[PDB]
Scaffold this active site. Sequence first.
Site, PDB file in Angstrom:
ATOM      1  N   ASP A   1      12.302  18.392  13.729  1.00 45.32           N
ATOM      2  CA  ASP A   1      13.445  19.291  13.676  1.00 45.32           C
ATOM      3  C   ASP A   1      13.091  20.703  13.209  1.00 45.32           C
ATOM      4  OD1 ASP A   1      15.984  20.197  13.887  1.00 45.32           O
ATOM      5  OD2 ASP A   1      16.706  19.300  12.021  1.00 45.32           O
TER       6      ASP A   1
ATOM      7  N   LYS B   1      13.258  24.464  12.929  1.00 41.43           N
ATOM      8  CA  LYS B   1      14.372  25.389  12.993  1.00 41.43           C
ATOM      9  C   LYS B   1      14.030  26.629  12.162  1.00 41.43           C
ATOM     10  CE  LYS B   1      17.003  22.096  10.686  1.00 41.43           C
ATOM     11  NZ  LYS B   1      16.708  21.453   9.414  1.00 41.43           N
TER      12      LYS B   1
ATOM     13  N   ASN C   1      13.688  26.469   8.249  1.00 40.89           N
ATOM     14  CA  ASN C   1      12.571  25.758   7.644  1.00 40.89           C
ATOM     15  C   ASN C   1      11.325  26.630   7.569  1.00 40.89           C
ATOM     16  OD1 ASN C   1      14.360  23.565   7.699  1.00 40.89           O
ATOM     17  ND2 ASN C   1      12.761  22.140   8.305  1.00 40.89           N
TER      18      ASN C   1
END
Length: 291
Positions: free
Chosen positions: A140, A142, A145
């Site tokens: 994930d 993104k 992050n």
Amino acid sequence: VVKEIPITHHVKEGYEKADPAQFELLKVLGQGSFGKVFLVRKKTGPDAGQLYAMKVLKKASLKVRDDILVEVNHPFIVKLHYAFQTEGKLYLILDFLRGGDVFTRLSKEVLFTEEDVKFYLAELALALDHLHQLGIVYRDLKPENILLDEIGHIKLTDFGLSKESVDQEKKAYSFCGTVEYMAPEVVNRRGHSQSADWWSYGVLMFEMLTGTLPFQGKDRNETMNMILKAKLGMPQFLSAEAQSLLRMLFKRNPANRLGSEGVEEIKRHLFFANIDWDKLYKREVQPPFKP
Ligand SMILES: Nc1ncnc2c1ncn2[C@@H]1O[C@H](COP(=O)(O)OP(=O)(O)NP(=O)(O)O)[C@@H](O)[C@H]1O
Ligand SMILES: Nc1ncnc2c1ncn2[C@@H]1O[C@H](COP(=O)(O)OP(=O)(O)NP(=O)(O)O)[C@@H](O)[C@H]1O
Ligand SMILES: [Zn+2]
């Protein structure tokens, strides 16, 4: 075979087992989808006085194909110093990054260049590949992050942990990742992969170079359909090299996609011809912006 390693205890080499009383709260640092990140000061021990980022979760495991909490160490990935369980909670003690996210810092400029973005994409590339060599998938990726340290170097805020919120209401409605960054096959529920990370990586490139997401609709369903089926014009203001990297990342079918055979073809791409990857890894290359 994909193995799921539960995370329940962790002590960095050289130190001793921690518990919630050894940390004092200063101020919240941010909020994710899995909770809040608090700034804490270690109260006692060798590292007394030291500042750390703290995450409070319910459960957290790590899926690996085929020590692991020490192997994930990398110049461009956050370090986990401690992990422990108490009263139905898992605590993660992490490296406290002082620079904020890359998007914030970029938004603080009137304009920037392909070269700046190239610095970030390169360090990021090395981080991803490092996790893939360990059989780990980031799942994930993104913008939230991707933080900056004090110097202006990249740090990922996680290394693919499979996490579970402690807020019972947030845990109730949780499912998979952030759709805007999902590869077509992830959207089609065929499962996360190294190749899917490289698609996410492409979406972040597009967004950084255009200020816009490539596929987004009025809701979840429309966004998904766009990811699968929509048109996507090439930004004509980009150089031929950038256009080429974008074109090679945005393949809806994996193993057609750049990076699904390692990062070597990514490092060799004409777009990164400028970059000394050894110097980059050693953090000897100068960041485009001071935080
Ligand atoms: N080690 C850290 N140091 C400083 N700030 C951090 C740190 N980790 C997270 N943050 C901030 O807290 C926010 C949450 O980050 P993140 O690690 O993505 O939360 P998460 O719930 O674990 N994952 P997500 O659901 O994708 O948000 C981000 O916007 C960061 O700016
Ligand atoms: N390290 C890995 N290597 C290869 N494949 C993986 C890895 N980790 C996860 N996967 C794939 O991703 C899937 C895991 O997702 P699953 O638990 O089925 O639902 P999900 O909601 O998509 N997972 P999550 O996004 O973590 O909530 C599996 O079917 C695996 O094939
Ligand atoms: Zn998922």
